[PDB]
Structure 1
Amino acid sequence: LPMVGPLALFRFADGKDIVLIFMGTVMSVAHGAVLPLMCIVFGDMTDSFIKDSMTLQEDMQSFAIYYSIMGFVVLVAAYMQVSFWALAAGRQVRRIRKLFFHRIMQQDIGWFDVNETGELNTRLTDDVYKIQEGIGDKVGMLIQAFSTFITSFIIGFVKGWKLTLVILAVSPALGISAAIFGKVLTNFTAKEQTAYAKAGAVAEEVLSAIRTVFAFSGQDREIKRYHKNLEDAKNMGIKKAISANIAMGFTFLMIYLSYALAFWYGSILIMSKEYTIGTVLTVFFVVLIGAFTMGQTSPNIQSFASARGAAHKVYSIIDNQPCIDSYSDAGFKPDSIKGNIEFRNIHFNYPSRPDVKILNNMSLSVKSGQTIALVGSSGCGKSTTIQLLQRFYDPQEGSVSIDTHDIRSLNVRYLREMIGVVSQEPILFATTIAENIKYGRPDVTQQEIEQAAKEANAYDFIMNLPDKFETLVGDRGTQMSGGQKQRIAIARALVRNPKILLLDEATSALDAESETIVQAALDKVRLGRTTIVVAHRLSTIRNADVIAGFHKGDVIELGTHSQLMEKQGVYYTLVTMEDENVPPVSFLKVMRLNLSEWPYMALGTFCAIINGMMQPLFAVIFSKIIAVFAEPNQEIVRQKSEFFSLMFAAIGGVTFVTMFLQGFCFGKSGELLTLKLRLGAFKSMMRQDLGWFDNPKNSVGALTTRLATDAAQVQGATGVRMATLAQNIANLGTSIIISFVYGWELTLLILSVVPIMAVAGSVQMQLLAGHAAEDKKELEKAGKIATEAIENIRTVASLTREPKFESLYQENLHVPYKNSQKKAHVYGFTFSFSQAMIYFAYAGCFRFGAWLIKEGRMDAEGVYLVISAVLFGAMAVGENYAKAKMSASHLMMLMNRE
């Protein structure tokens, strides 16, 4: 699909907005240079320690100040990046909303008839949200990662002649792996799609015709068939999960082989001494971080793509100006008008379906003070004419004369303002009685307001108003009645006393008293007013002096009703005719569901425990690698580096195998759990009486969606969640035990920086400060009001209130816009704080390790062990539970129910 270029994306930024974008860009570039630069100083510090492992205090102090200044500079840079980018996003979104609404209210009615209102609402809400999210932080981080990738390569150019090409020559192997896995992945996805297709097929057939299931009473063959289909789905899904786990393990193994090969090549350089160990470690770490950053940029790339598509559609709307602009500033705008209106040979076709000539030969004339009506069959060109007279549609053929001046020459605002129109079923606007009447005119006082209200005979129901006109209309007009609705409508039409009235079926769909009151209001209005009433009620039509029959957008008869009856025209025919309960279920019971699978659970738990243990082993081997690098001992060090490279390969292999077994075991266990729970659900359901399935919560689509979604969710979570708990607990226990054995002071230092980082980490990104709920709710409310305005577009036009509804739209946007700025500020604060915490932690941990070294209770190798191991444990902890708990509670309630 067409998608606009990035140059077009920021086409709504004004001068100060350009400065904002530029400042954000430069700050993001600084941040993305820091990241690789952070790794640079990290490797430099690593080398300095390696040599120091065998000049200490001053060196450590210098390193510490460098880290601290790096932390401060990244704090400032990131905070400013987020703040400026978010503020630019907010200004851009506000301007986008304003101009979008301006064009929408500018576009003619045919534009709406092309684009259904629901689609416009979805656009204005979701696409605006997408563009906001894209520009705000996603673009900033995108630029930042671009810069980091570029800087990693420049730094590899500084001294990496061999390592750069070696890691790039890993790229064909890495891509070979990623694609050889992907080719099997596509085939497996198709296979499992077939499997779930059969499973959902049996599900849909049994549920949709579950009444037939009871009728035929033959649940034997159907239950057995369900079991068969589920068994096949198990046979397939077990393999799918096994394959996915092998893919993950193979990715890990490729990573580890790259590690070991790079290390062996570095050892070769040290043998030749071409590259100092420090330089090799620096370049390797930096290239690795650059590669991982580039890889993990993908979600942001998708975010930008979505933003670009949304922006393309939005700007397509914006630049699609109408054939006529309501806000035009050209025309006669006569100071007066007699009022007569004449139409000739009107010819219009909707832009959506411009293939049938709906409108043809509507020669008609209305004289001031003359009562001429229009009657015909449904969709006989009635409303199209009324739309035209407001210049909703340009007559391709014909003429539209208003007292020697056509609608073409006259301005639109002026014309609409002095013209009144009432639809077949007009709808009040979502505002109190006061404002609903104020739309009459802006220059209106209370006394005349009540005068005009009573002018419509509405008096009867105002003495009962709790607050008179201040009385609230009520949601959706629930506290409202059709006759009273027409009363407010006609009153708001008359308040400004438009010269001419087009009452398009504004009498029907009412009760006897309601019809009487509207008829009385109309008769009072007909005093000295030029009227065109296309209505269905016989009283008004007969009261009308001249009536014109109609059919299929064609003139047939006109004059007194007697001629219509004599010809029996169309007039004669018209005359003759879920989440509440969610009881917390004991995890013991949920786990106990795997009764027979006890061996499977145990074997999988062993696999997960070993897997979790490995990572600390990675930390230890890394630490000892550094250690051996410390002592020159060239022969011993080269041999031991080879040894620990082979150990890296061994770790890759053990990770691969443990992933293989864990995936297989947990997949089988969870899939058997899925089978058992599905069979139990079927049995419980068929126990349930017919009425049980008539509840709206028990619709066929909803129930089958529950079945499939919840089964998959519990299968994944129940197996994955316990395994993950075990793995993480192993990581934490071993890391903490290692730290405590090494030293219980730096231990506590690490174990305190960790929690403060995590608490101030991902949770704060979307949870703390209590902005989320209010901001989302207010945005939803403003969008709802805008959506209502769009829906009632015809009435909004007849009112000529588009500017004022835009004004109210922006007014109610103001507060959520301020909340947007507030949330952006706090988001920036937490993000920068999180980023800087890492550097400050590095500095403090390393400094305290140095202090302990001065006391001798620890060694630098232990320092590296502790820091690296704890960091890797933090990363591992990253890898739903509530969804699984709720689903399991649902299933248990459904089964155990008698």
Structure 2
Amino acid sequence: LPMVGPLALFRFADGKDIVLIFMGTVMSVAHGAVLPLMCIVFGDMTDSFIKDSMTSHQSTLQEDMQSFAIYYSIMGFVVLVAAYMQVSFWALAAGRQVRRIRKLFFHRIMQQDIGWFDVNETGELNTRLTDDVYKIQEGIGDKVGMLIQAFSTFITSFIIGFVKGWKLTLVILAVSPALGISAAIFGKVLTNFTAKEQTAYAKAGAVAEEVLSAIRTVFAFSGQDREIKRYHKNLEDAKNMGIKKAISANIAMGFTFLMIYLSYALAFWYGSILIMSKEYTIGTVLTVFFVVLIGAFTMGQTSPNIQSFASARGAAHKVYSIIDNQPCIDSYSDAGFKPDSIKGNIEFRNIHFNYPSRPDVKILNNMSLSVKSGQTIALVGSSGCGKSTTIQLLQRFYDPQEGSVSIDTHDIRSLNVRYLREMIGVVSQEPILFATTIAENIKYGRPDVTQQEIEQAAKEANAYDFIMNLPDKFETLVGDRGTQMSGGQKQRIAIARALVRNPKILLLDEATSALDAESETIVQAALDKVRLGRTTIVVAHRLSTIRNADVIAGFHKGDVIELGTHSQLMEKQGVYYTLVTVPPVSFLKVMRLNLSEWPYMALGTFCAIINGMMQPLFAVIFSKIIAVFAEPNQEIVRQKSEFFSLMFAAIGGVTFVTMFLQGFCFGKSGELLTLKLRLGAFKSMMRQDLGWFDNPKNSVGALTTRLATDAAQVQGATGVRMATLAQNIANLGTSIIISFVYGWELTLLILSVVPIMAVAGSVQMQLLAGHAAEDKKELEKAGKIATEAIENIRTVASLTREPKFESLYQENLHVPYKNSQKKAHVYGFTFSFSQAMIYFAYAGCFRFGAWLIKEGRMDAEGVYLVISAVLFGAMAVGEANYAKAKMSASHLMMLMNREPAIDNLSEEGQSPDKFDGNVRFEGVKFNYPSRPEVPILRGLNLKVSKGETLALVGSSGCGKSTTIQLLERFYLDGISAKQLNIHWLRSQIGIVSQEPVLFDCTLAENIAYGDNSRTVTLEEIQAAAKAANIHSFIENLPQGYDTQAGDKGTQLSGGQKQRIAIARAILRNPKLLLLDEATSALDTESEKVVQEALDQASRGRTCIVVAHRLSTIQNADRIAVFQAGVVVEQGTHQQLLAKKGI
């Protein structure tokens, strides 16, 4: 997308904004510099500690630490002041820029031509306003400041690192390709296994969605278990691939960890080697290592601010392009002539018009008609071809592309737009009143009269009928929006607003339609009465306005043909001759699902606690490496440095193997849990009632996405949640115990400062709740008035009251500005304290450690071990979705055990071998949850016995919706409804689904599907297909019945689909067939073939015709009707055939 550079992004910065920007940039540079200086002083402090320890195998530690502590405090103060001031200046600049941007943007929008409004209109502009203003505010806000600080810190870190230790800096840098190639291998393996995992998961999700989409036919057939088998097998394969992906990702992360630790080890070994030669001192190596580390990590961390800068740049580009767009018609400029008086005439000389958007359409061609003032001229049209366009034009909404206007020897182009607009009075068909009092709404219009005639106008508009006895005499506090008016009321206030001193001319554009009869009469009377005294040309189609007239205007497609009497219009064949015209599940209940796989979770937790404890060991090894650089014997130094670098590598390897094992076990547990949850959820889906599913929240898409996503998400709350919490607990507990043992004093001091980091945020949240509230509310209401302005641009411009809307917008914007400044200041203080607290804690803790060292309670490395352990524990926890996983698990649990509302999978009940053929329904009062309000079902008492051919037609909304669904046992034959063997009833039926849905498998498999209790034999499949007449077309196929049919829905006709559906149905060879108007949506020949096949299959077999056309119903015995689930209009075929004459 287009993006502007820095020069344009800040174009709307004045001098006041520029000074703030300059100060912010300079202060941010200083802030960025401060951290590398911190590292330099840290290295010097380490050197001083080592010197004191070396002397004892002096008091200079006390004074040296005192000086370094004063240094640390001054760094703290400078960072506090600098960071607060940087954030404050940048936020203030953002606020001023955003305020001016909103002002100018709305000003320009209101300026744009209507020919430009119609091109993007309200949605684009409101989106732009909200989103893009957010983007621009976030761009030039604190984010650019953080970018500048990142640059400064990176450059300063590199320069100090080079200037101090060019050799060791070069070594650290040259170790970077190691991490680079580690990441390369990471990406390779990740991409390969990720693609494989997507393929595997999709292979099962496809079957999931195939079943869910066609659940009706999937379940109507006794094939609810073969689906379970298919899902089980596909999900087992997906489990294998998923565990492969998990182990791959874990090994990649472990290799990254191993390589970073190996980089540490090599760097420290080289530092030792140099120190032995006495080139770099321990302080120097520590300084250079930490400065390079901080530089790298800071560049990484401010990578995300780059994206914010870029998005802000793009949004700014579009906003600025809107700002600079100059409308062809200037609604604000005062350039033009203002004739002191105007006779009020109107003329047009072949004004050619085309909409700026899609100018190919040409409606106004050769429009030439004049109306001398003091006259009223009627208008007509069929599609509103010309009238709307010309009424828009007279308002200067669209520039006359070719023509001349000679209004009293004046051209509308050459006169002031505001004077022209106010010179005439026009109101839309339904002008949505602005969110104000009715008095203020009538005041809108001509402010020339403010109160005195504003109250008088009511008497003219026939609105007073309620105003005098309204809730208030003229409506203070009435508001509107919350209160509702009748259409006649809105129209009456509209005519009042029009008649508030409309100077000469008054027009109305289809201002009569969409009105009740009483309102129609009232408004017609009002229009008639207000016609007198001024030149009126109203666009309308009503008969009353049609008959009343003094002149006529005729252009049915934009063809001016008539300008005279009414009788002439009649003679002109006009319309005057066509007058006829969810309890959040707890942790324990979630773990009850992996209760089965606990063996894997146990080893996972054990290896996780080992992984966590490894971090404190890394802190302790850091303490020991720092301490062991103070040994006078050089050989001992080499031995210890070699051993500790080796132990660094060993901790890396332990972390690597432990991450690998963790990956293996937690992946396996998570995949087993996912398979179990998916299988249980699918089983619950199948068994549950049919009326459940059609619910909008139970949409096929909803269930599919739930199965795909929430299933995996649930892994986030059983093992990995336990693993992460165990790792964190082990890390902090071990760190705290080690620190306590080394010395409870410094342990307590660092622990006591730990609260100050976060607890200080309580005030931040207190002041930020107000921020969020004002943000949502003020955005909503300011944008609401913006949407009112833009969406009613027609009226807003025609009212000539754009400035008044601007003033309302600005007054609304006032409070957000103050709240934004408060937010800037409070965020600035919180950020400054968060930044300076680390420096202050360093200073205080190290001074205390010096004291304890002198007293004798803490060894030289005691302070380093305790501080490093606590700091690295904090970092580890900070590095280390749970609520989302809990929510998904709650939904899945309530799903898998919701209720057996209509137990369908219940294979209970007794099934006599013989089915007597009774379709009797006794005492069943039910109603569909889809249509419970509408009478669906009552004490149904329908009758059909064996050998019948009953037909039916539903007068109201496809009566099939009732009888087949009920009889199909979706919602009894002499036996109780639920006592019967539902499996037997579902098995012994010839129900044909409406739309034949075939399954993604062999045609042989689809044929065999009709039965799933017993396997299939090819001989019988052929028998059924030939009996189904489908063999005819199947005779030409790649392999025939067994064909995979790799087309997957191309080489199949509707008739072929119906034939295969019938073959599937009759595979059971049932003795009672049922239809659901399936034999439809096909060509006449296809339907004839379908009926021929069905009749052939009906040879010596009972059926119930439920077809939709007489062609099928020809071979029928009796026809029926059903209303509200009760027998009605039962009769013989000939009688009801006479009924449905059609």
TM-score bracket relative to the smaller structure: over 0.9
CA contact under 8 A between 1:53 and 1:630: conserved in structure 2?
yes
Q: C-alpha distance in 2, partners of 1:241/1:348?
A: 66
Match among 434, 442, 453 for residue 437 of structure 1: 442
Residue 739 of structure 1, CA deviation? 1.7
Residue 193 of structure 1, CA deviation? 4.5
Q: Which structure has more helix as a fraction of its residues?
A: 1
Aligned CA distance change for structure 1 residues 841 and 745 (closer, same or farther; 3 Å)? same
Identity %: 100
Residue 236 of structure 1, CA deviation? 3.5
Give the alignment's Cα RMSD to 1 decimal: 2.4
Instruction: Specify the alignment match of 1:792 in structure 2.
Output: 792
CA contact under 8 A between 2:436 and 2:480: conserved in structure 1?
no
Unaligned runs of 5+ in 1: 577-581
Deviations 1:413-436 (A, max 9, x none): 222223222223322222222322
Aligned CA distance change for structure 1 residues 215 and 121 (closer, same or farther; 3 Å)? farther
Deviations 1:617-653 (A, max 9, x none): 1100100000111224221112211221122222222
Deviations 1:103-142 (A, max 9, x none): 1111111222221421221111011111111211111101
Deviates more, 1:508-517 or 1:391-400: 391-400
Residue 381 of structure 1, CA deviation? 3.3
Instruction: Specify the alignment match of 2:865 in structure 1.
Output: 865
CA contact under 8 A between 2:422 and 2:502: conserved in structure 1?
no
Q: C-alpha distance in 1, partners of 2:497/2:713?
A: 55
Aligned CA distance change for structure 1 residues 438 and 475 (closer, same or farther; 3 Å)? closer
Residue 372 of structure 1, CA deviation? 1.6
CA contact under 8 A between 2:438 and 2:479: conserved in structure 1?
no
Aligned CA distance change for structure 1 residues 750 and 778 (closer, same or farther; 3 Å)? same
Q: C-alpha distance in 1, partners of 2:376/2:409?
A: 21
Max Rg structure = 2
CA contact under 8 A between 1:761 and 1:834: conserved in structure 2?
no
CA contact under 8 A between 2:130 and 2:783: conserved in structure 1?
yes
Unaligned runs of 5+ in 2: 55-59, 899-1142
Q: C-alpha distance in 1, partners of 2:212/2:340?
A: 70
Aligned CA distance change for structure 1 residues 597 and 324 (closer, same or farther; 3 Å)? same
Aligned CA distance change for structure 1 residues 187 and 532 (closer, same or farther; 3 Å)? farther
Q: C-alpha distance in 2, partners of 1:457/1:633?
A: 109
Aligned CA distance change for structure 1 residues 567 and 234 (closer, same or farther; 3 Å)? farther
Q: C-alpha distance in 2, partners of 1:567/1:320?
A: 47
Residue 16 of structure 1, CA deviation? 0.6
Residue 102 of structure 1, CA deviation? 0.9
- Secondary structure at 2:775's aligned position in 1? helix
Deviations 1:517-549 (A, max 9, x none): 211221122112222222122211221333333
CA contact under 8 A between 2:607 and 2:662: conserved in structure 1?
yes
Residue 393 of structure 1, CA deviation? 1.2
Deviations 1:267-296 (A, max 9, x none): 221122222221111011100100010011
Aligned CA distance change for structure 1 residues 202 and 532 (closer, same or farther; 3 Å)? farther
Q: C-alpha distance in 2, partners of 1:859/1:171?
A: 35
Instruction: Specify the alignment match of 1:586 in structure 2.
Output: 586
Residue 833 of structure 1, CA deviation? 0.7
Aligned CA distance change for structure 1 residues 51 and 553 (closer, same or farther; 3 Å)? farther
Deviates more, 1:503-512 or 1:775-784: 775-784
Residue 556 of structure 1, CA deviation? 4.2
CA contact under 8 A between 1:766 and 1:772: conserved in structure 2?
no
Instruction: Specify the alignment match of 2:262 in structure 1.
Output: 257
Aligned CA distance change for structure 1 residues 672 and 368 (closer, same or farther; 3 Å)? farther
Aligned CA distance change for structure 1 residues 361 and 676 (closer, same or farther; 3 Å)? farther
Q: C-alpha distance in 1, partners of 2:352/2:237?
A: 63
- Secondary structure at 1:808's aligned position in 2? helix
CA contact under 8 A between 2:587 and 2:717: conserved in structure 1?
no
Deviates more, 1:487-496 or 1:203-212: 203-212
Q: C-alpha distance in 1, partners of 2:437/2:701?
A: 40
Aligned CA distance change for structure 1 residues 9 and 594 (closer, same or farther; 3 Å)? same
Deviates more, 1:724-733 or 1:471-480: 471-480
Aligned CA distance change for structure 1 residues 711 and 67 (closer, same or farther; 3 Å)? same
Aligned CA distance change for structure 1 residues 335 and 396 (closer, same or farther; 3 Å)? same
CA contact under 8 A between 2:351 and 2:403: conserved in structure 1?
yes
CA contact under 8 A between 1:551 and 1:570: conserved in structure 2?
no
Residue 77 of structure 1, CA deviation? 0.4
Q: C-alpha distance in 2, partners of 1:516/1:214?
A: 61
Q: C-alpha distance in 1, partners of 2:724/2:588?
A: 17
Q: C-alpha distance in 2, partners of 1:766/1:655?
A: 42
CA contact under 8 A between 2:785 and 2:809: conserved in structure 1?
yes
Aligned CA distance change for structure 1 residues 32 and 484 (closer, same or farther; 3 Å)? same
Deviations 1:635-685 (A, max 9, x none): 111221122112222222222222222233323322333333333333334
Correspondence 1:124 to 2:129: yes
- Secondary structure at 2:398's aligned position in 1? coil
Correspondence 1:322 to 2:357: no
Residue 322 of structure 1, CA deviation? 1.3
Aligned CA distance change for structure 1 residues 56 and 807 (closer, same or farther; 3 Å)? same
CA contact under 8 A between 1:156 and 1:283: conserved in structure 2?
yes
Residue 460 of structure 1, CA deviation? 2.1
Deviations 1:62-108 (A, max 9, x none): 11111111111100000001111101101110111111111111111
CA contact under 8 A between 1:548 and 1:555: conserved in structure 2?
yes
Q: C-alpha distance in 1, partners of 2:767/2:222?
A: 52
Residue 472 of structure 1, CA deviation? 5.0
Deviations 1:215-261 (A, max 9, x none): 55643444444444444443343333333333332222222122111
Aligned CA distance change for structure 1 residues 367 and 245 (closer, same or farther; 3 Å)? farther
CA contact under 8 A between 2:714 and 2:888: conserved in structure 1?
yes
Instruction: Specify the alignment match of 2:712 in structure 1.
Output: 712
Q: C-alpha distance in 2, partners of 1:715/1:216?
A: 34
Deviations 1:339-384 (A, max 9, x none): 2122232323333323332432222222222212322232513332
CA contact under 8 A between 1:383 and 1:504: conserved in structure 2?
yes
Aligned CA distance change for structure 1 residues 841 and 347 (closer, same or farther; 3 Å)? same
- Secondary structure at 2:399's aligned position in 1? coil
Deviations 1:26-81 (A, max 9, x none): 11101100122122212221222122223111111111111111111100000001
Aligned CA distance change for structure 1 residues 121 and 707 (closer, same or farther; 3 Å)? farther
Aligned CA distance change for structure 1 residues 786 and 527 (closer, same or farther; 3 Å)? same
Deviates more, 1:215-224 or 1:746-755: 215-224
Deviates more, 1:314-323 or 1:555-564: 555-564
Aligned CA distance change for structure 1 residues 392 and 210 (closer, same or farther; 3 Å)? farther
Q: C-alpha distance in 1, partners of 2:452/2:713?
A: 64
After TM superposition, the score normalised by the length of structure 1 is 0.94
Deviates more, 1:421-430 or 1:847-856: 421-430
CA contact under 8 A between 1:267 and 1:641: conserved in structure 2?
yes
Aligned CA distance change for structure 1 residues 342 and 241 (closer, same or farther; 3 Å)? farther
Deviations 1:179-199 (A, max 9, x none): 343344444444444455555
Aligned CA distance change for structure 1 residues 241 and 554 (closer, same or farther; 3 Å)? farther
Q: C-alpha distance in 2, partners of 1:479/1:200?
A: 50
Instruction: Specify the alignment match of 1:518 in structure 2.
Output: 523
After TM superposition, the score normalised by the length of structure 2 is 0.75
Aligned CA distance change for structure 1 residues 424 and 608 (closer, same or farther; 3 Å)? same
Deviations 1:164-208 (A, max 9, x none): 222332333333333343344444444444455555544554445
CA contact under 8 A between 1:796 and 1:802: conserved in structure 2?
yes
Correspondence 1:29 to 2:29: yes
CA contact under 8 A between 1:113 and 1:350: conserved in structure 2?
no
Aligned CA distance change for structure 1 residues 437 and 575 (closer, same or farther; 3 Å)? farther
Aligned CA distance change for structure 1 residues 513 and 676 (closer, same or farther; 3 Å)? farther
